[PDB]
Amino acid sequence: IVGGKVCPKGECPWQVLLLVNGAQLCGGTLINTIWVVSAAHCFDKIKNWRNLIAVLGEHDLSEHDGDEQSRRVAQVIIPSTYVPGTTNHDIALLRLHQPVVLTDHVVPLCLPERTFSERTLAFVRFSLVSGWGQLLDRGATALELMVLNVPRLMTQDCLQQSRDSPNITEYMFCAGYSDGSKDSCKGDSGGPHATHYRGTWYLTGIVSWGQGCATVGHFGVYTRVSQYIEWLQKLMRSEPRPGVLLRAPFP
Amino acid sequence: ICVNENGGCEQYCSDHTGTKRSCRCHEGYSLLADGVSCTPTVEYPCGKIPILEKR
Ligand SMILES: O=C(O)c1cc2cc(Cl)ccc2[nH]1
Ligand SMILES: [Ca+2]
């Protein structure tokens, strides 16, 4: 996260940290005790599928304080329409091997209904993005969880206000600033874009892509979660299948 | 009714045949007798921050 602040410990309790062989991979969002939403591009280079770990209740990476909960990732579900190395349909649904225990430090974010998300949440201006990503473009990653408030743009405005570049599809939305001061970054990928509405927080986006980090004339691009609500809900109501990676038809 | 200011619902809104509207809540919440407000039914409802709630 570029130009944000430290998220006070326990204030982003749905934030997930994803690890591969103990190394920082991506972020994610806890949506109930066994399911995590992340970005499909996080898994393009995984070979060690058995060494994928999700950490909940994480805050400071240099110290174990006892609030952290680690779980092996039993399944990674990607839409059939996602193509590795590309940006469209950038979403993954992760099943944890065992549920996490809900505590003051581990709480899921509400996965909203599609209609509520499209006709109400999509109009809330500002939302929070968070992660342990780079504090700067070509800079070191954060030791403490960072959070940033970003405003959402209509796609027409994003394309007009912006300077080989990928297109902005109906499965994405733009959010942030074009002055090069504030943005999400590389290592924040998969993390939540969370929207507050009448005392409750909801999942509206997933940190997906951008041209560098906080590049002048460019905004962050987020997966438009509202397009995937039914796809996510049907998968969560289904029985697990052998093998970690699963490609599931979309729509 | 649901398209305009979320039909007055705190959370989810369903339109029905006529001028009829039903508000609904996410799991771990119950709808109050006002028919619009959602109250937590569990210790850790989704999208609420316990350290801020217990302050
Ligand atoms: O990998 C990167 O360079 C990268 C990923 C990413 C995601 C957002 Cl939302 C904004 C900027 C970003 N840069
Ligand atoms: Ca720690």
Side-chain angles (χ1 to χ4, degrees), chain A residues 1-44 46 49 51-155 157-159 161-163 166-251, chain B residues 1-16 18 20-55:
Chain A
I1 298 293
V2 185
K5 64 170 183 79
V6 174
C7 192
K9 183 181 152 70
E11 297 197 15
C12 298
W14 33 79
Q15 177 78 50
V16 182
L17 170 67
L18 292 179
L19 303 174
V20 58
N21 305 300
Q24 190 174 326
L25 172 68
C26 276
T29 308
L30 189 69
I31 59 167
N32 54 54
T33 65
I34 63 153
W35 299 100
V36 167
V37 176
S38 193
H41 84 259
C42 283
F43 309 92
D44 282 4
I46 304 305
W49 291 95
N51 307 128
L52 237 175
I53 292 285
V55 186
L56 268 298
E58 185 58 278
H59 171 66
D60 185 330
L61 309 185
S62 71
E63 180 190 57
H64 176 87
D65 63 15
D67 296 326
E68 303 91 341
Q69 295 181 45
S70 290
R71 299 292 186 272
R72 301 196 291 269
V73 172
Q75 189 127 78
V76 176
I77 313 170
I78 303 292
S80 57
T81 53
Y82 172 72
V83 174
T86 72
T87 58
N88 209 200
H89 302 286
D90 194 15
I91 182 168
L93 177 67
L94 279 55
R95 197 194 301 256
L96 300 187
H97 182 243
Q98 193 164 276
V100 288
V101 179
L102 303 187
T103 66
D104 285 4
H105 295 91
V106 172
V107 177
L109 185 58
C110 305
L111 179 67
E113 276 184 9
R114 180 203 271 264
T115 58
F116 173 62
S117 192
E118 290 173 347
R119 60 186 57 152
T120 298
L121 296 183
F123 302 103
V124 178
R125 245 276 269 198
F126 287 90
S127 294
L128 303 175
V129 296
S130 48
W132 289 268
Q134 297 185 171
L135 292 171
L136 298 173
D137 185 22
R138 297 178 289 189
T141 58
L143 280 179
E144 283 190 297
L145 179 61
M146 313 288 299
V147 64
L148 178 67
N149 206 19
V150 286
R152 185 166 171 167
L153 283 94
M154 267 316 303
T155 293
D157 308 346
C158 188
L159 290 163
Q161 284 170 247
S162 217
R163 243 118 113 124
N167 294 268
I168 293 137
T169 74
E170 290 291 336
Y171 301 98
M172 308 168 186
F173 67 87
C174 276
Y177 304 89
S178 61
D179 74 350
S181 68
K182 294 167 227 74
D183 200 5
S184 39
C185 215
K186 187 208 103 289
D188 298 309
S189 285
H193 172 276
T195 306
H196 193 265
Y197 186 79
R198 291 187 186 165
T200 299
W201 296 87
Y202 298 90
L203 184 64
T204 45
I206 303 160
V207 178
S208 179
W209 65 277
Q211 201 177 303
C213 314
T215 296
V216 299
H218 293 278
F219 298 94
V221 192
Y222 297 85
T223 306
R224 191 188 290 174
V225 171
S226 66
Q227 296 281 47
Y228 303 95
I229 304 304
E230 340 255 69
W231 179 85
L232 293 168
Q233 288 291 354
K234 186 172 173 281
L235 291 162
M236 295 189 287
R237 280 187 269 103
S238 84
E239 293 291 343
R241 292 177 176 276
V244 177
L245 178 69
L246 174 75
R247 291 182 64 247
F250 181 80
Chain B
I1 322 101
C2 299
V3 285
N4 322 125
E5 295 196 295
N6 199 42
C9 310
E10 174 179 335
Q11 300 185 357
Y12 314 143
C13 190
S14 293
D15 285 298
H16 290 132
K20 304 181 178 85
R21 175 277 269 145
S22 284
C23 298
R24 291 174 294 99
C25 303
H26 191 275
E27 217 174 287
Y29 289 92
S30 272
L31 188 77
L32 293 183
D34 65 12
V36 294
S37 302
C38 294
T39 193
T41 57
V42 291
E43 189 177 12
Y44 297 112
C46 74
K48 292 210 191 266
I49 307 160
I51 66 149
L52 299 178
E53 290 296 320
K54 300 169 185 185
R55 200 181 270 180

